[PDB]
Amino acid sequence: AIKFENVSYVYSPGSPLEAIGLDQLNFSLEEGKFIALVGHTGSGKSTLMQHFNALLKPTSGKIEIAGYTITPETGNKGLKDLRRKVSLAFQFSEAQLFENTVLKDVEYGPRNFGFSEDEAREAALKWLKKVGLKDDLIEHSPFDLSGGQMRRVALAGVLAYEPEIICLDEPAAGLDPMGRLEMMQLFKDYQAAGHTVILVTHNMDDVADYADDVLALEHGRLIKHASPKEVFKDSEWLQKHHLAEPRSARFAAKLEAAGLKLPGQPLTMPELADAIKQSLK
Amino acid sequence: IIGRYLPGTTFVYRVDPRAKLLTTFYFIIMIFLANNWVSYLVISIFGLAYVFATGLKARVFWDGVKPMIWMIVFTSLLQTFFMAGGKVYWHWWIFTLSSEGLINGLYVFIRFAMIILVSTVMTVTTKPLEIADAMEWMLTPLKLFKVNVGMISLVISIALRFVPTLFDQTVKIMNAQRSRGADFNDGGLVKRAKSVVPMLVPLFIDSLEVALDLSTAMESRGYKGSEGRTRYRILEWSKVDLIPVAYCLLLTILMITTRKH
Amino acid sequence: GSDNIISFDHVTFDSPRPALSDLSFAIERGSWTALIGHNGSGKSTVSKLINGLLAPDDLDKSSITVDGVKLGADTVWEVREKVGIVFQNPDNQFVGATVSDDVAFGLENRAVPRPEMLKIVAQAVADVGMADYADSEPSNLSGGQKQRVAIAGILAVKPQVIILDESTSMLDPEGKEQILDLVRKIKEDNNLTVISITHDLEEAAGADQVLVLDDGQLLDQGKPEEIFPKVEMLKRIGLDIPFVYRLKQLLKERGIVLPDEIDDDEKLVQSLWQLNSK
Amino acid sequence: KLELRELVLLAMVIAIKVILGQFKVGNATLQVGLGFIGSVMLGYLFGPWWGFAGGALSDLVSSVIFGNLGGFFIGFTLTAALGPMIYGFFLYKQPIQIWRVIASVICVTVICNIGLNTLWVSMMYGINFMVALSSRILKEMITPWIQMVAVWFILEGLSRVKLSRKFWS
Ligand SMILES: Nc1ncnc2c1ncn2[C@@H]1O[C@H](COP(=O)(O)OP(=O)(O)OP(=O)(O)O)[C@@H](O)[C@H]1O
Ligand SMILES: Nc1ncnc2c1ncn2[C@@H]1O[C@H](COP(=O)(O)OP(=O)(O)O)[C@@H](O)[C@H]1O
Ligand SMILES: [Mg+2]
């Protein structure tokens, strides 16, 4: 499980430039669910992301994650075992590929966490098969690849050791629709395997379709923490807090403005189609 | 740690950056001429006047001198021991505190202090873009070699713009590598040496892509070489620039008469 | 009268597959022609080839003409004055040390006297919504602000064609909307032609003409209301079906019958409302 | 000479050297600055003479952005320009070998770190040459043996990068 107590992060404590990155946060994320972290630009999503693996340590806060406890005065020793269980993929993670070989780059992850020379290789091939990258592209340089293939290699690099908690910063930003859907289904299937996925994204359609919990930030302050069918229930509330709503929800709102009833809350396209079918039934 | 300029309203802030840089260079050159107590007193008075004329708190000078105080102390004491002479106050195997040794140590400390203070005054009270413009202006005489100083100025301008960006990219790359188990300060000599590659190779790739994108962007906007281009950002003189001209010139007298010929 | 016209041509950077192959299209004057395709379809090379950065492999049968002048090694730096491109990455193209210097880079390159440069730069910076940021450093600006600076710099030299090469891909949705609205306002005011290169079809939904590319070949061209309904072609080459047509396809599979001319969601919702009468 | 794209790459490498000048690696008492790495990049990629330019400008640029608290002086600029010149002489187009790395590091630390830097510190601060050298020689005898291994691994990585689709040769 993941749990925050009163947490604050202040950039450059003291100093004339003292920006409050995070405000008083209090939430608990249940292990094994899909969580989508949403908010406008500059809301502190990246700081909250980095707080998970103790890259950024709190200021007057307590974090309980993967059995570990992080406090403002904790040291850098022992974070090697935390970063094995809680792993973060940053935005444009394809920029981190540096190794001589695709396979070597994928297995650079597990090897750092004590994997043997055979276990790391087997995990690396397994996840290279899973991410969709085909076989002959192995033993190639990571730089002699397409953008989508480079991103697949980068994601396989951080999924290769099976971390319990994975936090993804806009994983499918620039991919094709087929690749985007493939990556989203990969993360959903990883979540269905018992692990926890925390997604930081601006796409509300993905939040409606896949997320089980929605974590809404505004100016470093947690404004809402609930299921997607409750975060997107009030359009004016979303507009006030710089939050967008699903395109399916927008169409549902327009149809209801035309007067046609729609049972439930059609946040995704199959639900909208079924709602229309029931309305005209 | 990027950015050391501290805004202020005193007349030093209005001096043209070229004149301020010339004053710094000339002060460093003139420090070479100090070899007796009179000349060191003269440079001390002039440097302290230049420091007070900025209006800055002494804390900025102290912060500037902290990184080198160990070097200053070690150099001063070793010069004191190696140039010992005259009256002896404490004698050991090699350590011999002496009047001439203390005088030489004081001289070395004064040279260190005033070089550091003049450099801090130049750095703090000038915007980085203006220092860049002054440095590009002082590279003008190289045109007698027919070297394209336009390319030199363009390279300096582009490099100064991209240090803040590439630094943040380096931080991002280190964080991305650390998130998957990389250790950048542990593991002994060989592992520490190996750990620099995960930092450098993606940074070099980013530099390559930035170079290609910026070259295309510059070529598409009409760039065809430094020959035949006007300027938007210019440096222009004023009356205040007569202050450094006198301040140096007067100094040039007070040293020459007073130094031990 | 067409602004850009290209006769069939191909370019190779050295590579077996040419990036383009017999590409041939015409672009009107005062249009919002939208260029869409795959991430390896050859759109960026088209953008770079319009202003003369790249040259066709056989000049004897290839032809590129912008604003009535035919592109050639001698004519480059004359077509490049009439068309400007805003590239994908906001900060990689930011060359100046400040906003004013970045805007003034293009005028410096043309040996404009400084007294006129000051006025032109001030007016160009005021045309976009960044009048007070005339001294901000590149690192103090967001992606949308840097794209505004790029558009202002392009607008300073007064081009006749603006090519937005996936300019809004790396911005937040509100930044995307703000930049697109700013570009539309500038196009209306200065009477320009805008060629928008984009991956998602939402931007192309408002275009006056749509060009779709695949493997370096022009697969189809026409109005967005006639390109989008061919959903099978869009799915074949892997492109995002726009919202209304995708929803109409789902209603088709659900058994609901709608006219094929249905378009932007207001018409769709009113069609469902009129169907609800029975 | 260098085309526009190569000039922008030279500016990128200058910025990389300036940034690496601020990065230290080591324990609580023994720390080595990574600046030498940048110098190798200026010698391996752009040759002996252009690296010299990249050596000089990197000293100006850093002094502009991080402050030259060691005194605004042209001798340190000459040293920072002379380093990459030797690195380029030893490593520009030749295949990566152990003896080239050894020789380049030794020659750079003998001519630039020992010698020129000691001479200019002595001239600036009035102390004679032996006083300046005795106050330094510990670092210039410890650091090169680390710079050797670091340069070997950096050259391996950069040779890996150069032979790719990214680099435009
Ligand atoms: N410098 C280069 N050398 C060789 N081939 C290249 C180079 N740059 C691109 N290509 C190739 O040329 C083809 C055309 O790519 P292009 O850049 O036109 O695509 P795009 O999807 O329009 O790009 P963008 O995303 O920038 O809009 C691709 O197969 C690409 O891999
Ligand atoms: N390196 C930094 N130094 C100081 N302040 C920062 C830094 N990075 C971010 N901030 C501030 O902290 C807040 C958190 O922003 P961020 O976490 O980047 O939000 P997002 O991830 O949504 O862009 C921002 O409003 C920004 O002003
Ligand atoms: Mg983010």
PDB file of C-alpha atoms in Angstrom, chain A residues 104-267:
ATOM      1  CA  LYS A 104      22.151  -4.899 -22.608  1.00  0.00           C
ATOM      2  CA  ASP A 105      20.130  -1.720 -22.080  1.00  0.00           C
ATOM      3  CA  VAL A 106      17.071  -3.682 -20.955  1.00  0.00           C
ATOM      4  CA  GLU A 107      19.132  -5.834 -18.589  1.00  0.00           C
ATOM      5  CA  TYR A 108      21.016  -2.849 -17.148  1.00  0.00           C
ATOM      6  CA  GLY A 109      17.962  -2.419 -14.926  1.00  0.00           C
ATOM      7  CA  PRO A 110      17.799  -5.840 -13.264  1.00  0.00           C
ATOM      8  CA  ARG A 111      21.584  -6.177 -12.987  1.00  0.00           C
ATOM      9  CA  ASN A 112      21.788  -3.071 -10.797  1.00  0.00           C
ATOM     10  CA  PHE A 113      19.324  -4.713  -8.384  1.00  0.00           C
ATOM     11  CA  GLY A 114      21.333  -7.881  -7.756  1.00  0.00           C
ATOM     12  CA  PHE A 115      20.026 -10.014 -10.612  1.00  0.00           C
ATOM     13  CA  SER A 116      22.431 -12.701 -11.774  1.00  0.00           C
ATOM     14  CA  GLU A 117      23.889 -12.758 -15.279  1.00  0.00           C
ATOM     15  CA  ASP A 118      21.251 -15.316 -16.303  1.00  0.00           C
ATOM     16  CA  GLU A 119      18.195 -14.045 -14.419  1.00  0.00           C
ATOM     17  CA  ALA A 120      18.698 -10.543 -15.802  1.00  0.00           C
ATOM     18  CA  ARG A 121      18.987 -11.880 -19.360  1.00  0.00           C
ATOM     19  CA  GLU A 122      15.886 -14.055 -19.055  1.00  0.00           C
ATOM     20  CA  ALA A 123      13.832 -11.195 -17.598  1.00  0.00           C
ATOM     21  CA  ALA A 124      15.119  -8.861 -20.310  1.00  0.00           C
ATOM     22  CA  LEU A 125      14.068 -11.169 -23.146  1.00  0.00           C
ATOM     23  CA  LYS A 126      10.713 -11.842 -21.480  1.00  0.00           C
ATOM     24  CA  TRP A 127       9.878  -8.156 -21.209  1.00  0.00           C
ATOM     25  CA  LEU A 128      11.274  -7.382 -24.668  1.00  0.00           C
ATOM     26  CA  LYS A 129       8.829  -9.961 -26.016  1.00  0.00           C
ATOM     27  CA  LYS A 130       6.016  -8.536 -23.884  1.00  0.00           C
ATOM     28  CA  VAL A 131       6.456  -4.877 -24.873  1.00  0.00           C
ATOM     29  CA  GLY A 132       5.933  -5.834 -28.518  1.00  0.00           C
ATOM     30  CA  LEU A 133       9.480  -5.361 -29.778  1.00  0.00           C
ATOM     31  CA  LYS A 134      10.295  -8.256 -32.082  1.00  0.00           C
ATOM     32  CA  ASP A 135      13.307 -10.576 -31.988  1.00  0.00           C
ATOM     33  CA  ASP A 136      15.782  -9.530 -34.688  1.00  0.00           C
ATOM     34  CA  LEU A 137      15.920  -5.963 -33.347  1.00  0.00           C
ATOM     35  CA  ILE A 138      17.780  -7.359 -30.330  1.00  0.00           C
ATOM     36  CA  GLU A 139      21.588  -7.128 -30.667  1.00  0.00           C
ATOM     37  CA  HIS A 140      21.034  -3.759 -32.334  1.00  0.00           C
ATOM     38  CA  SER A 141      22.197  -0.427 -31.002  1.00  0.00           C
ATOM     39  CA  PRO A 142      19.399   1.422 -29.157  1.00  0.00           C
ATOM     40  CA  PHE A 143      20.089   4.528 -31.266  1.00  0.00           C
ATOM     41  CA  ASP A 144      19.434   2.678 -34.547  1.00  0.00           C
ATOM     42  CA  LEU A 145      15.732   2.339 -33.762  1.00  0.00           C
ATOM     43  CA  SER A 146      12.500   4.209 -34.376  1.00  0.00           C
ATOM     44  CA  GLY A 147      11.003   6.527 -31.783  1.00  0.00           C
ATOM     45  CA  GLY A 148       8.293   4.045 -30.852  1.00  0.00           C
ATOM     46  CA  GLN A 149      10.782   1.180 -30.683  1.00  0.00           C
ATOM     47  CA  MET A 150      13.112   3.320 -28.563  1.00  0.00           C
ATOM     48  CA  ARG A 151      10.239   4.071 -26.185  1.00  0.00           C
ATOM     49  CA  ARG A 152       9.366   0.369 -26.021  1.00  0.00           C
ATOM     50  CA  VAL A 153      12.984  -0.400 -25.114  1.00  0.00           C
ATOM     51  CA  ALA A 154      12.941   2.342 -22.471  1.00  0.00           C
ATOM     52  CA  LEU A 155       9.751   0.996 -20.877  1.00  0.00           C
ATOM     53  CA  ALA A 156      11.025  -2.592 -20.968  1.00  0.00           C
ATOM     54  CA  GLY A 157      14.106  -1.278 -19.183  1.00  0.00           C
ATOM     55  CA  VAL A 158      12.047  -0.138 -16.180  1.00  0.00           C
ATOM     56  CA  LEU A 159       9.605  -3.066 -16.211  1.00  0.00           C
ATOM     57  CA  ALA A 160      12.291  -5.757 -16.507  1.00  0.00           C
ATOM     58  CA  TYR A 161      12.691  -6.481 -12.769  1.00  0.00           C
ATOM     59  CA  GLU A 162       8.934  -6.564 -12.033  1.00  0.00           C
ATOM     60  CA  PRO A 163       8.675  -3.645  -9.581  1.00  0.00           C
ATOM     61  CA  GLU A 164       5.661  -3.755  -7.288  1.00  0.00           C
ATOM     62  CA  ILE A 165       4.749  -0.112  -7.987  1.00  0.00           C
ATOM     63  CA  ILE A 166       5.288   1.519 -11.389  1.00  0.00           C
ATOM     64  CA  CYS A 167       4.766   5.251 -11.911  1.00  0.00           C
ATOM     65  CA  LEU A 168       4.608   6.450 -15.517  1.00  0.00           C
ATOM     66  CA  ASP A 169       4.949  10.071 -16.671  1.00  0.00           C
ATOM     67  CA  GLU A 170       3.052  10.339 -19.986  1.00  0.00           C
ATOM     68  CA  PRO A 171       4.191   6.957 -21.377  1.00  0.00           C
ATOM     69  CA  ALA A 172       2.327   7.054 -24.712  1.00  0.00           C
ATOM     70  CA  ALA A 173       2.643  10.778 -25.485  1.00  0.00           C
ATOM     71  CA  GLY A 174       3.925  10.572 -29.062  1.00  0.00           C
ATOM     72  CA  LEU A 175       3.080   7.024 -30.139  1.00  0.00           C
ATOM     73  CA  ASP A 176       0.796   5.847 -32.926  1.00  0.00           C
ATOM     74  CA  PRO A 177      -2.768   4.820 -32.003  1.00  0.00           C
ATOM     75  CA  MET A 178      -1.848   1.140 -32.326  1.00  0.00           C
ATOM     76  CA  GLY A 179       1.278   1.590 -30.217  1.00  0.00           C
ATOM     77  CA  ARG A 180      -0.581   3.819 -27.758  1.00  0.00           C
ATOM     78  CA  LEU A 181      -3.308   1.212 -27.270  1.00  0.00           C
ATOM     79  CA  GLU A 182      -0.696  -1.544 -26.995  1.00  0.00           C
ATOM     80  CA  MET A 183       1.195   0.329 -24.268  1.00  0.00           C
ATOM     81  CA  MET A 184      -1.992   1.146 -22.353  1.00  0.00           C
ATOM     82  CA  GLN A 185      -3.085  -2.494 -22.496  1.00  0.00           C
ATOM     83  CA  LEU A 186       0.402  -3.529 -21.361  1.00  0.00           C
ATOM     84  CA  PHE A 187       0.100  -1.322 -18.281  1.00  0.00           C
ATOM     85  CA  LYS A 188      -3.454  -2.517 -17.613  1.00  0.00           C
ATOM     86  CA  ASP A 189      -2.350  -6.161 -17.833  1.00  0.00           C
ATOM     87  CA  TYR A 190       0.580  -5.394 -15.530  1.00  0.00           C
ATOM     88  CA  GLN A 191      -1.929  -3.910 -13.079  1.00  0.00           C
ATOM     89  CA  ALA A 192      -4.124  -7.005 -13.417  1.00  0.00           C
ATOM     90  CA  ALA A 193      -1.116  -9.130 -12.402  1.00  0.00           C
ATOM     91  CA  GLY A 194      -1.210  -7.729  -8.852  1.00  0.00           C
ATOM     92  CA  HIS A 195       1.070  -4.700  -9.199  1.00  0.00           C
ATOM     93  CA  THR A 196       0.158  -1.035  -8.729  1.00  0.00           C
ATOM     94  CA  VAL A 197       0.295   1.479 -11.590  1.00  0.00           C
ATOM     95  CA  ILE A 198       0.262   5.252 -11.058  1.00  0.00           C
ATOM     96  CA  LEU A 199      -0.240   7.168 -14.304  1.00  0.00           C
ATOM     97  CA  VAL A 200       0.489  10.881 -14.715  1.00  0.00           C
ATOM     98  CA  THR A 201      -1.336  12.052 -17.815  1.00  0.00           C
ATOM     99  CA  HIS A 202      -3.299  14.883 -19.406  1.00  0.00           C
ATOM    100  CA  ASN A 203      -5.521  12.536 -21.457  1.00  0.00           C
ATOM    101  CA  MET A 204      -8.849  12.225 -19.654  1.00  0.00           C
ATOM    102  CA  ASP A 205     -10.034   9.483 -22.021  1.00  0.00           C
ATOM    103  CA  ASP A 206      -7.339   7.137 -20.698  1.00  0.00           C
ATOM    104  CA  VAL A 207      -8.233   8.145 -17.132  1.00  0.00           C
ATOM    105  CA  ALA A 208     -11.883   7.287 -17.763  1.00  0.00           C
ATOM    106  CA  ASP A 209     -11.100   4.033 -19.572  1.00  0.00           C
ATOM    107  CA  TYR A 210      -8.391   2.461 -17.391  1.00  0.00           C
ATOM    108  CA  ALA A 211      -7.996   4.182 -14.015  1.00  0.00           C
ATOM    109  CA  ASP A 212      -9.617   2.857 -10.845  1.00  0.00           C
ATOM    110  CA  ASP A 213      -8.673   5.895  -8.738  1.00  0.00           C
ATOM    111  CA  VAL A 214      -8.120   9.509  -9.788  1.00  0.00           C
ATOM    112  CA  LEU A 215      -5.748  11.761  -7.838  1.00  0.00           C
ATOM    113  CA  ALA A 216      -6.358  15.432  -8.631  1.00  0.00           C
ATOM    114  CA  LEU A 217      -3.811  18.144  -7.837  1.00  0.00           C
ATOM    115  CA  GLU A 218      -4.118  21.934  -7.972  1.00  0.00           C
ATOM    116  CA  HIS A 219      -1.228  24.282  -7.141  1.00  0.00           C
ATOM    117  CA  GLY A 220       0.459  21.560  -5.112  1.00  0.00           C
ATOM    118  CA  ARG A 221      -2.704  20.825  -3.110  1.00  0.00           C
ATOM    119  CA  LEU A 222      -4.726  17.619  -3.313  1.00  0.00           C
ATOM    120  CA  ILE A 223      -8.220  18.709  -4.343  1.00  0.00           C
ATOM    121  CA  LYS A 224      -9.908  15.366  -4.971  1.00  0.00           C
ATOM    122  CA  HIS A 225      -9.188  11.656  -4.583  1.00  0.00           C
ATOM    123  CA  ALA A 226     -11.950   9.359  -5.837  1.00  0.00           C
ATOM    124  CA  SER A 227     -13.075   7.070  -8.638  1.00  0.00           C
ATOM    125  CA  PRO A 228     -13.250   8.505 -12.179  1.00  0.00           C
ATOM    126  CA  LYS A 229     -17.057   8.434 -12.165  1.00  0.00           C
ATOM    127  CA  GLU A 230     -16.978  10.869  -9.216  1.00  0.00           C
ATOM    128  CA  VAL A 231     -14.170  13.213 -10.283  1.00  0.00           C
ATOM    129  CA  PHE A 232     -15.794  13.925 -13.663  1.00  0.00           C
ATOM    130  CA  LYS A 233     -19.352  14.124 -12.297  1.00  0.00           C
ATOM    131  CA  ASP A 234     -19.526  17.944 -12.057  1.00  0.00           C
ATOM    132  CA  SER A 235     -18.464  19.830 -15.183  1.00  0.00           C
ATOM    133  CA  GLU A 236     -18.335  23.237 -13.479  1.00  0.00           C
ATOM    134  CA  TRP A 237     -16.102  21.837 -10.734  1.00  0.00           C
ATOM    135  CA  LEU A 238     -13.724  20.547 -13.414  1.00  0.00           C
ATOM    136  CA  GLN A 239     -13.730  23.910 -15.198  1.00  0.00           C
ATOM    137  CA  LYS A 240     -13.020  25.798 -11.967  1.00  0.00           C
ATOM    138  CA  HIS A 241      -9.989  23.675 -11.037  1.00  0.00           C
ATOM    139  CA  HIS A 242      -8.380  23.733 -14.523  1.00  0.00           C
ATOM    140  CA  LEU A 243      -9.445  20.121 -15.148  1.00  0.00           C
ATOM    141  CA  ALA A 244     -10.665  18.742 -18.459  1.00  0.00           C
ATOM    142  CA  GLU A 245     -13.370  16.115 -18.932  1.00  0.00           C
ATOM    143  CA  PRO A 246     -13.585  13.111 -21.272  1.00  0.00           C
ATOM    144  CA  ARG A 247     -14.723  13.720 -24.835  1.00  0.00           C
ATOM    145  CA  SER A 248     -17.346  11.015 -24.315  1.00  0.00           C
ATOM    146  CA  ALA A 249     -18.497  12.957 -21.251  1.00  0.00           C
ATOM    147  CA  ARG A 250     -18.636  16.152 -23.327  1.00  0.00           C
ATOM    148  CA  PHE A 251     -20.819  14.436 -25.924  1.00  0.00           C
ATOM    149  CA  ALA A 252     -23.032  13.047 -23.153  1.00  0.00           C
ATOM    150  CA  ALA A 253     -23.417  16.545 -21.700  1.00  0.00           C
ATOM    151  CA  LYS A 254     -24.296  17.986 -25.114  1.00  0.00           C
ATOM    152  CA  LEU A 255     -26.852  15.235 -25.750  1.00  0.00           C
ATOM    153  CA  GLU A 256     -28.427  15.864 -22.341  1.00  0.00           C
ATOM    154  CA  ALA A 257     -28.497  19.568 -23.209  1.00  0.00           C
ATOM    155  CA  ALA A 258     -30.494  18.493 -26.254  1.00  0.00           C
ATOM    156  CA  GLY A 259     -32.710  16.799 -23.643  1.00  0.00           C
ATOM    157  CA  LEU A 260     -32.045  13.084 -24.295  1.00  0.00           C
ATOM    158  CA  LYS A 261     -31.628  11.041 -21.122  1.00  0.00           C
ATOM    159  CA  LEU A 262     -28.525   8.887 -20.668  1.00  0.00           C
ATOM    160  CA  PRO A 263     -28.493   6.223 -17.919  1.00  0.00           C
ATOM    161  CA  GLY A 264     -25.423   6.137 -15.714  1.00  0.00           C
ATOM    162  CA  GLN A 265     -22.276   8.087 -16.565  1.00  0.00           C
ATOM    163  CA  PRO A 266     -20.922   7.202 -20.042  1.00  0.00           C
ATOM    164  CA  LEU A 267     -17.259   8.074 -19.558  1.00  0.00           C
TER     165      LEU A 267
END
